[PDB]
Amino acid sequence: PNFSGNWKIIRSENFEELLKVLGVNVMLRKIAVAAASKYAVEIKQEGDTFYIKVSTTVYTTEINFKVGEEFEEQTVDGRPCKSLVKWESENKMVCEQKLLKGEGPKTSWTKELTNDGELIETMTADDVVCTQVFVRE
Numbered sequence: 592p593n594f595s596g597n598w599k600i601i602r603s604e605n606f607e608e609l610l611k612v613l614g615v616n617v618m619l620r621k622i623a624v625a626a627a628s629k630y631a632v633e634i635k636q637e638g639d640t641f642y643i644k645v646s647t648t649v650y651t652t653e654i655n656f657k658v659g660e661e662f663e664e665q666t667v668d669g670r671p672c673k674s675l676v677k678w679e680s681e682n683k684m685v686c687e688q689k690l691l692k693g694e695g696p697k698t699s700w701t702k703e704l705t706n707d708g709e710l711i712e713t714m715t716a717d718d719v720v721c722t723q724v725f726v727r728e
């Protein structure tokens with residue numbers, strides 16, 4: 592497929608419930624939901640090597656990985672983790688995460704290109720799934 596592009600969010604569901612699972616207190620959850628409405632993703636894909644830059648109004652981070660190759664990033668609530676991305680189908684990848692220290696909820700994310708030109712990201716903590724939908728800029 593081709594995930595490359597500059598993606599702009601159009602919809603975000605269940606994000607507050609995800610942060611609650613992760614222990615974020617109420618006022619910060621609401622602030623973070625508002626921040627997620629300016630969530631933007633820039634992707635450069637070459638083969639199965641991905642360069643991804645996620646940003647909001649005041650914060651930006653880049654995530655670089657190769658499918659099937661373990662790497663280090665951070666969970667949504669910011670704890671460092673080791674991650675491994677695999678393909679689930681032609682246009683969908685799934686990442687499993689494992690905390691480097693301590694314990695916590697089981698987290699993961701997915702990215703999918705739809706046939707309608709949308710990018711769908713999900714983030715999971717235990718039973719709760721947040722879904723975010725993007726279109727190309």
Ligand SMILES: *C/C=C(C)/C=C/C=C(C)/C=C/C1=C(C)CCCC1(C)C
Nearest residue numbers: 623626627630645647654666667702
């Ligand atoms: C492939 C996409 C990945 C790895 C996306 C990771 C995104 C995050 C960890 C996003 C976190 C957010 C917050 C904790 C607050 C502000 C809004 C977000 C969505 C940028």
